[PDB]
Subunit: 55 residues, 7 copies
């Protein structure tokens, strides 16, 4: 049908792996990894504030 | 009733596939893929700046 | 002997929405799906308007 | 007893009594919240298809 | 150990009620209530504005 | 036998040892996080019931 | 597809530990810890506002 193009695209992605359920987890994990890296950067780039701002 | 238009729209989307439960997953997967891509861009466009910063 | 206590208007509203369908659990999914669809569309726009912007 | 620092918890607990089944309370709220968020998204969508017509 | 301070704090909160699982729900519900109120304000302040 | 790129994972794993049952660790954090988020929300709410007041009175 | 590269990357991460399900939890926990720290800072840097006036 029409309107379902988004769904089909997602469905196609679910075939990147044998268990489509594994696809979602893989992405969730990768996404976590990326978000964490940004968080680590913010944390460091703020301690680099306080450390210098102890100065 | 009336006020249920949003619900109906969602319900219609759930018919893009035989198993409506698959529809939600398909969308979640696609959404993950998009979000990840943006995260990758931000990551690259930041590693591209730490570099510039020291030249 | 039930009387709904005070400060529950939000709850009632949600409850009313749960009657848009025979099965209330189906209501939440329907909305979640629609919401996903909308968010995705926005994401697609941002993606296109970024492959385009800077393109010239 | 009930320790101090649990005021937030008690408030939530009180809300869970708006209905016979407390698990229904959380769902009711989640649904209403979804409805509100969707409405906002619909507005943004329209007010963007309109930027793209009105000029 | 150390670094576990956050965990301990959360653990302490889980003792606000006999069933710790009820604590998380209570908070989730309260949070929902607050978020909704904000959403309602934004909605009204847009139908107005 | 851990590869490289797994540093984030190891860190999380170490946190999971703050308590005997590891599943309890995640809940404890989720609860604490909720508490903090809520406090911020309450502040925003108060600082808006206050601000509109300053603007409109 | 530029689709499967993302998946592969995630899949590789799932091998940081013997049980891949543990990987996701470890990350979720770490992420929580980071978010909480930020929240604590915001809270303090706002109570430090409700001091000066
Ligand atoms: Cl409230
Ligand atoms: Cl993609």
């Amino acid at each position: 049908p029409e309107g379902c193009e988004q769904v089909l695209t997602g469905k196609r992605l679910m075939q990147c792996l044998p268990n489509p359920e594994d696809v979602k987890m893989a992405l969730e994990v990768y996404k976590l990894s990326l978000e964490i890296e940004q968080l680590e950067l913010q944390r460091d780039s703020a301690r680099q504030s306080t450390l210098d701002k102890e100065l």
